[PDB]
Amino acid sequence: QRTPKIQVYSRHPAENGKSNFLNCYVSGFHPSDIEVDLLKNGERIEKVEHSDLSFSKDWSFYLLYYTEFTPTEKDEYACRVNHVTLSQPKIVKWDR
Amino acid sequence: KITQTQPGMFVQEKEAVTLDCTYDTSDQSYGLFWYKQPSSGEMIFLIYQGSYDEQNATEGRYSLNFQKARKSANLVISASQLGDSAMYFCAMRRNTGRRALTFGSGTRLQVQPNIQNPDPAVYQLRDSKSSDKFVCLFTDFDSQINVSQSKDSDVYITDKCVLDMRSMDFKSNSAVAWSNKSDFTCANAFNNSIIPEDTFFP
Amino acid sequence: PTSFHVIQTSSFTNSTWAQTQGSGWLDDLQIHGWDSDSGTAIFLKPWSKGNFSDKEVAELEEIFRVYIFGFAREVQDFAGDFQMKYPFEIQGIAGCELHSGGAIVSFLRGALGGLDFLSVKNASCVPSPEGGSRAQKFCALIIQYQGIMETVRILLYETCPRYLLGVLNAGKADLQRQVKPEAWLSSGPSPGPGRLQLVCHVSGFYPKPVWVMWMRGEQEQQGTQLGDILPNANWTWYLRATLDVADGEAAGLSCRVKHSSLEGQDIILYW
Amino acid sequence: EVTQTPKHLVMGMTNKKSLKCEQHMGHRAMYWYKQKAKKPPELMFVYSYEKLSINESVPSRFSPECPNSSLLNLHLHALQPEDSALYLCASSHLGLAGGIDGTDTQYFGPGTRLTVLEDLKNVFPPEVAVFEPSKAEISRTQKATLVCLATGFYPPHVELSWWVNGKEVHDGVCTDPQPLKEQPALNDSRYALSSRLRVSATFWQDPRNHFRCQVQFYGLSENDEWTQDRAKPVTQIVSAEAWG
Ligand SMILES: CCCCCCCCCCCCCCC[C@@H](O)[C@@H](CCCCCCCCCCCCCC)C(=O)OC[C@H]1O[C@H](O[C@H]2O[C@H](CO)[C@@H](O)[C@H](O)[C@H]2O)[C@H](O)[C@@H](O)[C@@H]1O
Ligand SMILES: *[C@@H]1O[C@H](CO)[C@@H](O)[C@H](O)[C@H]1NC(C)=O
Ligand SMILES: *[C@@H]1O[C@H](CO)[C@@H](O)[C@H](O)[C@H]1NC(C)=O
Ligand SMILES: *[C@@H]1O[C@H](CO)[C@@H](O)[C@H](O)[C@H]1NC(C)=O
């Protein structure tokens, strides 16, 4: 049992009115069952895509969920992860 | 691919016949199978030899001549009986292959009986109901002589078929021929095929 | 160093429910995806086939398809004897690595519940002690099946090196390209009064190795934490280097980035 | 052993039929083979763990299906005349269950002689007759040779058998392995088959012995569509008798 570690970031520096990629990378968790959502201001961005399942030399999995977006000054982006090792879902807010 | 390179083999009864099968796969670690298909159609497994078994697999009357270096494994049947007349296939399965059998072209085997006292003759058989219809039979001839189909497209001539009786332990080749042409008589039915000179006629 | 390996993850929930996923990776770029529903292989790159012919590609695909179909059923069959407790997970990774100097080394490793179970060297049992008693038991049974061991050895020491060389030569253009790294600077709320954090983000670079340092002129300033090199879609990498410092000393500081794609033209970001 | 009902099948270009192959040894993998005339069997489908693992470019008319782990059907509909051949079902062990010996031998079943037809008018029932032995034979060889002749049947799917005194026999009976075409160089030629029985002269000379050549013909099923004044060529038994 290993609690996932979550890191969120953007492929390009935070501009306003500029297309960019928002990534949420979850690492070092076990077992493989996990649910990850990307949250814009609380509602769920349903246009997220994820890479295939992989694991490191410790047999601890890791995934990334990345999506197109266009940051503004009012919006709010975060990553919500729920997994067996966590009793309540954990939210990690993207920083700028 | 597996090349049998054999049209068809003939062998007397109570002898040994070496059916050939040469494959061209350069990969090691495979499995060689032999399958027999009688006239009925069903495929009957015969013998199996692993590539690494370092020993010519023998099972019943079927032996093997597996030579890995020469890429050939000729099945050997010892003391062939009349029941060994069938299609023979040489299939091969590879460790990293198709996971299913791959058959060669196959080789017909026609074991023939040893006729002790040949007595070739042609007998005219009369129908049970209508005497006008009739067919006549060429029988009790030697194993070596073959019978060929007539050049005419109306005269019907069957194939040399070996008939065996377990009561008095008798085996005898025979062939039957009939036609609807009025002029057709087996005074000259088998005129196309070679016939023994002393063939008795009625 | 350029270790092409396929990986498999199987999750068993109940006596008749089990899922299986698989994928083949070059180093960390996914090359082969696997649709386990229809049991087909998806080639995610133009050079995913290497120099292999399509016929041997089909042969390998069918071998993997049969193995994927049967693994769950066989594990379910033997779980009664092995005293598996449901649910559980079985992971496997097998492939070949090209060491520097042209010495290809093949490897296979398995794990249950996140703990090492077994490995092969010279096509033989190596039951990892973490797997414990059952581990040995299992591989002992596995020793009996000569055909399975022969297939494993053939795929490991005879086919994997050929495939690895094929893809390394074929995918030469994509493997050895260079992309300049973007870089920028940001502030960070650090613990302690009169304190601050400086974050130098470097993104979009390839290949993976890179040297990023928070330096005051050429003083070679220490206290720079380099976070793990996070991946990024489009097949580049991202990395933030953080430095903690009290307010006032921010002047005279700059993050310096050295990467192969810059051919000695280092990136300097002043703060 | 493997059962592969039905053993014979005659089909049109619009009918839908099914082929059932069933084995109770519970192997694992099942196969479908198709063998043409005087050709090695060719693989069609492979089912591993009740999942289709190999499809050798078989057209979409064939619809295989593996409901149980000990069953493998094959549904056909709207076939074509070239699709007439012998269809064999095969079974074999797979890994971790066949034991130490990883031979994975394949066990075949009695194939199904599927002959499809674009015109149902061609199917005919055989006409059989029995020819009594000649006086020349019994005089010299002291043996009698009954000859049965089944002519004019199509498709060539018949099973000839001899019955002496109401009892099926297997001693001193021979039959041509393959039927002989009646009008060669024609794709719709009717077929003729022959068989011979040899017995002692005394046996034939008894006036209280019954010889019956019985031909089992596999033709049209009862539910097929017949629109001809001729009797519907259903599968039937045609026999001819003889007395001493
Ligand atoms: C090109 C990419 C490079 C990546 C390389 C990846 C390295 C490792 C890959 C190994 C994957 C597994 C391969 C074997 C699985 C199939 O081949 C097998 C299907 C059934 C498997 C179900 C149970 C699996 C248990 C775990 C196995 C691995 C554990 C690791 C141990 C440490 C299969 O193919 O079985 C079919 C038959 O194969 C052989 O039979 C074949 O060979 C013999 C003679 O050699 C012939 O007689 C046969 O005709 C031929 O089919 C086996 O002998 C037989 O038992 C199998 O039934
Ligand atoms: C047995 O196999 C070996 C291996 O090639 C061969 O040299 C030898 O002739 C075989 N023996 C017989 C009797 O065929
Ligand atoms: C008869 O057929 C056999 C088998 O092909 C052949 O070896 C033999 O030479 C033939 N004899 C004659 C007279 O045609
Ligand atoms: C096999 O492949 C052919 C190729 O077109 C396809 O038409 C057919 O439906 C396939 N059969 C099955 C059972 O998937």
mmCIF file of N, CA and C in Angstrom, chain C residues 173-271:
data_model
loop_
_atom_site.group_PDB
_atom_site.id
_atom_site.type_symbol
_atom_site.label_atom_id
_atom_site.label_comp_id
_atom_site.label_asym_id
_atom_site.label_seq_id
_atom_site.Cartn_x
_atom_site.Cartn_y
_atom_site.Cartn_z
ATOM 1 N N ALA C 173 16.183 8.717 -36.336
ATOM 2 C CA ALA C 173 15.848 10.129 -36.477
ATOM 3 C C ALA C 173 15.135 10.653 -35.240
ATOM 4 N N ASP C 174 14.145 9.908 -34.747
ATOM 5 C CA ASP C 174 13.384 10.375 -33.596
ATOM 6 C C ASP C 174 14.161 10.211 -32.299
ATOM 7 N N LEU C 175 14.993 9.174 -32.202
ATOM 8 C CA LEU C 175 15.666 8.885 -30.941
ATOM 9 C C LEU C 175 16.699 9.947 -30.597
ATOM 10 N N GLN C 176 17.446 10.428 -31.590
ATOM 11 C CA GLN C 176 18.603 11.276 -31.340
ATOM 12 C C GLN C 176 18.368 12.731 -31.725
ATOM 13 N N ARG C 177 17.114 13.146 -31.859
ATOM 14 C CA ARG C 177 16.834 14.548 -32.108
ATOM 15 C C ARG C 177 17.081 15.367 -30.845
ATOM 16 N N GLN C 178 17.178 16.681 -31.023
ATOM 17 C CA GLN C 178 17.385 17.608 -29.921
ATOM 18 C C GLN C 178 16.376 18.741 -30.018
ATOM 19 N N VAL C 179 15.802 19.118 -28.879
ATOM 20 C CA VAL C 179 14.856 20.223 -28.809
ATOM 21 C C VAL C 179 15.321 21.189 -27.731
ATOM 22 N N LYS C 180 15.321 22.475 -28.054
ATOM 23 C CA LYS C 180 15.753 23.477 -27.095
ATOM 24 C C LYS C 180 14.773 23.542 -25.927
ATOM 25 N N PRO C 181 15.259 23.712 -24.710
ATOM 26 C CA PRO C 181 14.351 23.813 -23.564
ATOM 27 C C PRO C 181 13.879 25.230 -23.291
ATOM 28 N N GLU C 182 12.567 25.422 -23.201
ATOM 29 C CA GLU C 182 12.038 26.664 -22.662
ATOM 30 C C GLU C 182 12.349 26.748 -21.175
ATOM 31 N N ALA C 183 12.413 27.972 -20.661
ATOM 32 C CA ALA C 183 12.683 28.163 -19.246
ATOM 33 C C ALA C 183 12.061 29.468 -18.781
ATOM 34 N N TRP C 184 11.608 29.475 -17.531
ATOM 35 C CA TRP C 184 11.069 30.687 -16.932
ATOM 36 C C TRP C 184 11.228 30.611 -15.421
ATOM 37 N N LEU C 185 10.868 31.703 -14.754
ATOM 38 C CA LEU C 185 11.079 31.855 -13.324
ATOM 39 C C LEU C 185 9.772 32.207 -12.631
ATOM 40 N N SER C 186 9.645 31.771 -11.380
ATOM 41 C CA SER C 186 8.443 32.049 -10.610
ATOM 42 C C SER C 186 8.787 32.109 -9.129
ATOM 43 N N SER C 187 7.888 32.721 -8.370
ATOM 44 C CA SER C 187 8.022 32.849 -6.929
ATOM 45 C C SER C 187 7.237 31.750 -6.226
ATOM 46 N N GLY C 188 7.610 31.497 -4.975
ATOM 47 C CA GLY C 188 6.985 30.460 -4.195
ATOM 48 C C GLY C 188 6.925 30.794 -2.719
ATOM 49 N N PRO C 189 5.761 30.553 -2.113
ATOM 50 C CA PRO C 189 5.601 30.818 -0.678
ATOM 51 C C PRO C 189 6.386 29.831 0.167
ATOM 52 N N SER C 190 7.428 30.313 0.823
ATOM 53 C CA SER C 190 8.283 29.432 1.591
ATOM 54 C C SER C 190 8.013 29.587 3.083
ATOM 55 N N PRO C 191 8.218 28.531 3.865
ATOM 56 C CA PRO C 191 8.025 28.641 5.313
ATOM 57 C C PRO C 191 9.053 29.564 5.945
ATOM 58 N N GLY C 192 8.658 30.171 7.061
ATOM 59 C CA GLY C 192 9.528 31.055 7.796
ATOM 60 C C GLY C 192 9.292 32.511 7.453
ATOM 61 N N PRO C 193 9.272 33.369 8.469
ATOM 62 C CA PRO C 193 9.135 34.806 8.214
ATOM 63 C C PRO C 193 10.359 35.357 7.503
ATOM 64 N N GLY C 194 10.126 36.370 6.671
ATOM 65 C CA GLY C 194 11.193 36.977 5.901
ATOM 66 C C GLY C 194 11.885 35.981 4.994
ATOM 67 N N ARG C 195 11.097 35.154 4.312
ATOM 68 C CA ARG C 195 11.630 34.052 3.530
ATOM 69 C C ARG C 195 10.852 33.929 2.227
ATOM 70 N N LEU C 196 11.478 33.284 1.244
ATOM 71 C CA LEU C 196 10.893 33.164 -0.084
ATOM 72 C C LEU C 196 11.495 31.961 -0.795
ATOM 73 N N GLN C 197 10.834 31.550 -1.879
ATOM 74 C CA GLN C 197 11.301 30.454 -2.711
ATOM 75 C C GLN C 197 11.357 30.911 -4.160
ATOM 76 N N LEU C 198 12.425 30.537 -4.855
ATOM 77 C CA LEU C 198 12.587 30.828 -6.272
ATOM 78 C C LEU C 198 12.550 29.521 -7.049
ATOM 79 N N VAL C 199 11.685 29.452 -8.058
ATOM 80 C CA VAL C 199 11.494 28.243 -8.846
ATOM 81 C C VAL C 199 11.899 28.542 -10.279
ATOM 82 N N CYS C 200 12.862 27.782 -10.790
ATOM 83 C CA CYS C 200 13.268 27.853 -12.188
ATOM 84 C C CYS C 200 12.660 26.654 -12.904
ATOM 85 N N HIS C 201 11.709 26.916 -13.795
ATOM 86 C CA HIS C 201 11.075 25.867 -14.577
ATOM 87 C C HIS C 201 11.792 25.734 -15.910
ATOM 88 N N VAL C 202 12.154 24.505 -16.267
ATOM 89 C CA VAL C 202 12.727 24.195 -17.568
ATOM 90 C C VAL C 202 11.892 23.084 -18.186
ATOM 91 N N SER C 203 11.360 23.338 -19.376
ATOM 92 C CA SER C 203 10.361 22.468 -19.973
ATOM 93 C C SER C 203 10.660 22.257 -21.446
ATOM 94 N N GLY C 204 10.118 21.169 -21.981
ATOM 95 C CA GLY C 204 10.170 20.929 -23.405
ATOM 96 C C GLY C 204 11.475 20.384 -23.930
ATOM 97 N N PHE C 205 12.380 19.947 -23.064
ATOM 98 C CA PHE C 205 13.680 19.486 -23.520
ATOM 99 C C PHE C 205 13.684 17.983 -23.759
ATOM 100 N N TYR C 206 14.668 17.545 -24.532
ATOM 101 C CA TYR C 206 14.918 16.150 -24.857
ATOM 102 C C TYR C 206 16.297 16.073 -25.496
ATOM 103 N N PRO C 207 17.123 15.081 -25.155
ATOM 104 C CA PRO C 207 16.870 13.931 -24.279
ATOM 105 C C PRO C 207 16.793 14.281 -22.798
ATOM 106 N N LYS C 208 16.514 13.271 -21.977
ATOM 107 C CA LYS C 208 16.225 13.496 -20.562
ATOM 108 C C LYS C 208 17.341 14.196 -19.796
ATOM 109 N N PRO C 209 18.612 13.795 -19.890
ATOM 110 C CA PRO C 209 19.626 14.396 -19.013
ATOM 111 C C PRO C 209 19.740 15.899 -19.214
ATOM 112 N N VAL C 210 19.920 16.613 -18.104
ATOM 113 C CA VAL C 210 19.980 18.069 -18.113
ATOM 114 C C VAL C 210 20.593 18.509 -16.795
ATOM 115 N N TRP C 211 21.295 19.640 -16.819
ATOM 116 C CA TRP C 211 21.959 20.173 -15.633
ATOM 117 C C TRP C 211 21.423 21.571 -15.350
ATOM 118 N N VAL C 212 20.668 21.715 -14.265
ATOM 119 C CA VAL C 212 20.064 22.985 -13.883
ATOM 120 C C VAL C 212 20.554 23.349 -12.491
ATOM 121 N N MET C 213 21.062 24.571 -12.339
ATOM 122 C CA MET C 213 21.612 24.999 -11.059
ATOM 123 C C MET C 213 21.245 26.442 -10.754
ATOM 124 N N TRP C 214 20.897 26.694 -9.496
ATOM 125 C CA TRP C 214 20.634 28.043 -9.000
ATOM 126 C C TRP C 214 21.964 28.626 -8.545
ATOM 127 N N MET C 215 22.520 29.548 -9.326
ATOM 128 C CA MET C 215 23.856 30.065 -9.081
ATOM 129 C C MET C 215 23.823 31.577 -8.907
ATOM 130 N N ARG C 216 24.645 32.070 -7.986
ATOM 131 C CA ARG C 216 24.849 33.503 -7.794
ATOM 132 C C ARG C 216 26.113 33.871 -8.561
ATOM 133 N N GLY C 217 25.938 34.451 -9.744
ATOM 134 C CA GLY C 217 27.065 34.677 -10.624
ATOM 135 C C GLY C 217 27.741 33.368 -10.970
ATOM 136 N N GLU C 218 28.931 33.144 -10.410
ATOM 137 C CA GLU C 218 29.616 31.863 -10.535
ATOM 138 C C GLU C 218 29.962 31.279 -9.171
ATOM 139 N N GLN C 219 29.286 31.734 -8.115
ATOM 140 C CA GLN C 219 29.561 31.276 -6.758
ATOM 141 C C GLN C 219 29.189 29.814 -6.543
ATOM 142 N N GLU C 220 28.415 29.222 -7.453
ATOM 143 C CA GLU C 220 27.922 27.852 -7.321
ATOM 144 C C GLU C 220 27.102 27.715 -6.035
ATOM 145 N N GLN C 221 25.981 28.433 -6.019
ATOM 146 C CA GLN C 221 25.123 28.471 -4.844
ATOM 147 C C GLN C 221 24.503 27.104 -4.585
ATOM 148 N N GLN C 222 24.523 26.684 -3.323
ATOM 149 C CA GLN C 222 23.984 25.395 -2.918
ATOM 150 C C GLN C 222 22.530 25.556 -2.478
ATOM 151 N N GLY C 223 21.981 24.520 -1.850
ATOM 152 C CA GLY C 223 20.613 24.584 -1.382
ATOM 153 C C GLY C 223 19.573 24.534 -2.473
ATOM 154 N N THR C 224 19.919 23.997 -3.639
ATOM 155 C CA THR C 224 19.000 23.899 -4.766
ATOM 156 C C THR C 224 18.436 22.485 -4.810
ATOM 157 N N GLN C 225 17.129 22.365 -4.604
ATOM 158 C CA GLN C 225 16.453 21.079 -4.684
ATOM 159 C C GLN C 225 15.937 20.885 -6.103
ATOM 160 N N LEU C 226 16.388 19.820 -6.752
ATOM 161 C CA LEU C 226 15.933 19.468 -8.089
ATOM 162 C C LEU C 226 14.828 18.432 -7.950
ATOM 163 N N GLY C 227 13.600 18.832 -8.260
ATOM 164 C CA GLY C 227 12.503 17.891 -8.240
ATOM 165 C C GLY C 227 12.681 16.799 -9.274
ATOM 166 N N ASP C 228 11.921 15.725 -9.097
ATOM 167 C CA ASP C 228 11.976 14.623 -10.044
ATOM 168 C C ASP C 228 11.593 15.112 -11.433
ATOM 169 N N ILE C 229 12.269 14.576 -12.446
ATOM 170 C CA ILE C 229 12.049 15.020 -13.815
ATOM 171 C C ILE C 229 10.708 14.481 -14.283
ATOM 172 N N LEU C 230 9.685 15.323 -14.222
ATOM 173 C CA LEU C 230 8.348 14.897 -14.578
ATOM 174 C C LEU C 230 8.230 14.724 -16.088
ATOM 175 N N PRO C 231 7.446 13.758 -16.538
ATOM 176 C CA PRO C 231 7.243 13.566 -17.969
ATOM 177 C C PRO C 231 6.246 14.589 -18.484
ATOM 178 N N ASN C 232 6.049 14.569 -19.795
ATOM 179 C CA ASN C 232 5.147 15.508 -20.439
ATOM 180 C C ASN C 232 4.783 14.932 -21.794
ATOM 181 N N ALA C 233 3.507 15.020 -22.158
ATOM 182 C CA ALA C 233 3.080 14.557 -23.468
ATOM 183 C C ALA C 233 3.837 15.308 -24.557
ATOM 184 N N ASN C 234 3.756 14.788 -25.781
ATOM 185 C CA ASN C 234 4.501 15.256 -26.947
ATOM 186 C C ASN C 234 5.949 14.777 -26.832
ATOM 187 N N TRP C 235 6.279 14.024 -25.778
ATOM 188 C CA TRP C 235 7.577 13.363 -25.614
ATOM 189 C C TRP C 235 8.694 14.371 -25.346
ATOM 190 N N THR C 236 8.444 15.263 -24.396
ATOM 191 C CA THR C 236 9.464 16.105 -23.795
ATOM 192 C C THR C 236 9.349 15.982 -22.285
ATOM 193 N N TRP C 237 10.235 16.664 -21.570
ATOM 194 C CA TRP C 237 10.262 16.575 -20.122
ATOM 195 C C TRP C 237 10.203 17.957 -19.490
ATOM 196 N N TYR C 238 9.789 17.978 -18.228
ATOM 197 C CA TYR C 238 9.624 19.200 -17.461
ATOM 198 C C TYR C 238 10.300 19.017 -16.114
ATOM 199 N N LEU C 239 10.848 20.104 -15.579
ATOM 200 C CA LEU C 239 11.579 20.018 -14.322
ATOM 201 C C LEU C 239 11.621 21.388 -13.669
ATOM 202 N N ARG C 240 11.275 21.445 -12.390
ATOM 203 C CA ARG C 240 11.367 22.671 -11.614
ATOM 204 C C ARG C 240 12.469 22.523 -10.575
ATOM 205 N N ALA C 241 13.382 23.486 -10.546
ATOM 206 C CA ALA C 241 14.444 23.534 -9.550
ATOM 207 C C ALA C 241 14.118 24.646 -8.567
ATOM 208 N N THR C 242 14.022 24.299 -7.290
ATOM 209 C CA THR C 242 13.596 25.236 -6.264
ATOM 210 C C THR C 242 14.768 25.614 -5.373
ATOM 211 N N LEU C 243 14.766 26.860 -4.911
ATOM 212 C CA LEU C 243 15.767 27.337 -3.968
ATOM 213 C C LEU C 243 15.086 28.181 -2.905
ATOM 214 N N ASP C 244 15.406 27.905 -1.647
ATOM 215 C CA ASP C 244 14.883 28.674 -0.531
ATOM 216 C C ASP C 244 15.891 29.743 -0.132
ATOM 217 N N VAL C 245 15.408 30.964 0.082
ATOM 218 C CA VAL C 245 16.303 32.058 0.444
ATOM 219 C C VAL C 245 15.490 33.142 1.133
ATOM 220 N N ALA C 246 16.111 33.798 2.109
ATOM 221 C CA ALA C 246 15.492 34.947 2.749
ATOM 222 C C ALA C 246 15.427 36.119 1.777
ATOM 223 N N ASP C 247 14.456 36.999 2.000
ATOM 224 C CA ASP C 247 14.282 38.148 1.123
ATOM 225 C C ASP C 247 15.461 39.102 1.253
ATOM 226 N N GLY C 248 15.889 39.652 0.120
ATOM 227 C CA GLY C 248 17.017 40.561 0.102
ATOM 228 C C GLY C 248 18.183 40.033 -0.705
ATOM 229 N N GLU C 249 18.436 38.731 -0.605
ATOM 230 C CA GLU C 249 19.514 38.090 -1.345
ATOM 231 C C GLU C 249 19.086 37.640 -2.734
ATOM 232 N N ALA C 250 17.841 37.919 -3.129
ATOM 233 C CA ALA C 250 17.366 37.509 -4.446
ATOM 234 C C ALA C 250 18.179 38.145 -5.564
ATOM 235 N N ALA C 251 18.700 39.348 -5.340
ATOM 236 C CA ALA C 251 19.530 40.000 -6.340
ATOM 237 C C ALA C 251 20.836 39.237 -6.532
ATOM 238 N N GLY C 252 21.350 39.280 -7.758
ATOM 239 C CA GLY C 252 22.564 38.567 -8.091
ATOM 240 C C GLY C 252 22.395 37.080 -8.291
ATOM 241 N N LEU C 253 21.163 36.590 -8.362
ATOM 242 C CA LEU C 253 20.883 35.173 -8.524
ATOM 243 C C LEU C 253 20.360 34.898 -9.926
ATOM 244 N N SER C 254 20.670 33.708 -10.433
ATOM 245 C CA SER C 254 20.193 33.306 -11.744
ATOM 246 C C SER C 254 20.189 31.789 -11.810
ATOM 247 N N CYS C 255 19.196 31.237 -12.491
ATOM 248 C CA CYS C 255 19.179 29.806 -12.749
ATOM 249 C C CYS C 255 19.820 29.542 -14.106
ATOM 250 N N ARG C 256 20.762 28.604 -14.132
ATOM 251 C CA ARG C 256 21.508 28.261 -15.332
ATOM 252 C C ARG C 256 21.131 26.857 -15.776
ATOM 253 N N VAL C 257 20.900 26.709 -17.076
ATOM 254 C CA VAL C 257 20.459 25.468 -17.692
ATOM 255 C C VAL C 257 21.484 25.066 -18.740
ATOM 256 N N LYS C 258 21.994 23.842 -18.624
ATOM 257 C CA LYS C 258 22.874 23.239 -19.613
ATOM 258 C C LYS C 258 22.223 21.961 -20.115
ATOM 259 N N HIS C 259 22.079 21.857 -21.432
ATOM 260 C CA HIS C 259 21.483 20.695 -22.065
ATOM 261 C C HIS C 259 22.198 20.454 -23.384
ATOM 262 N N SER C 260 22.153 19.206 -23.850
ATOM 263 C CA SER C 260 22.864 18.854 -25.073
ATOM 264 C C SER C 260 22.362 19.654 -26.266
ATOM 265 N N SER C 261 21.061 19.937 -26.317
ATOM 266 C CA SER C 261 20.491 20.670 -27.439
ATOM 267 C C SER C 261 21.001 22.099 -27.534
ATOM 268 N N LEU C 262 21.613 22.627 -26.478
ATOM 269 C CA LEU C 262 22.123 23.988 -26.495
ATOM 270 C C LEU C 262 23.567 24.081 -26.966
ATOM 271 N N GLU C 263 24.209 22.943 -27.250
ATOM 272 C CA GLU C 263 25.592 22.846 -27.716
ATOM 273 C C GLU C 263 26.512 23.870 -27.060
ATOM 274 N N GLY C 264 26.446 23.978 -25.735
ATOM 275 C CA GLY C 264 27.310 24.869 -24.995
ATOM 276 C C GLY C 264 26.792 26.278 -24.816
ATOM 277 N N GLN C 265 25.682 26.637 -25.457
ATOM 278 C CA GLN C 265 25.077 27.954 -25.271
ATOM 279 C C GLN C 265 24.119 27.853 -24.092
ATOM 280 N N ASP C 266 24.655 28.055 -22.892
ATOM 281 C CA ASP C 266 23.880 27.866 -21.676
ATOM 282 C C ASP C 266 22.770 28.905 -21.570
ATOM 283 N N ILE C 267 21.695 28.531 -20.883
ATOM 284 C CA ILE C 267 20.574 29.431 -20.638
ATOM 285 C C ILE C 267 20.740 30.032 -19.252
ATOM 286 N N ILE C 268 20.655 31.355 -19.160
ATOM 287 C CA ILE C 268 20.770 32.067 -17.894
ATOM 288 C C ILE C 268 19.498 32.870 -17.679
ATOM 289 N N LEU C 269 18.870 32.687 -16.520
ATOM 290 C CA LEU C 269 17.664 33.423 -16.159
ATOM 291 C C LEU C 269 17.939 34.189 -14.874
ATOM 292 N N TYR C 270 18.022 35.512 -14.984
ATOM 293 C CA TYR C 270 18.322 36.370 -13.849
ATOM 294 C C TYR C 270 17.074 36.627 -13.016
ATOM 295 N N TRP C 271 17.282 36.868 -11.726
ATOM 296 C CA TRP C 271 16.182 37.212 -10.836
ATOM 297 C C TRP C 271 16.545 38.398 -9.953
#
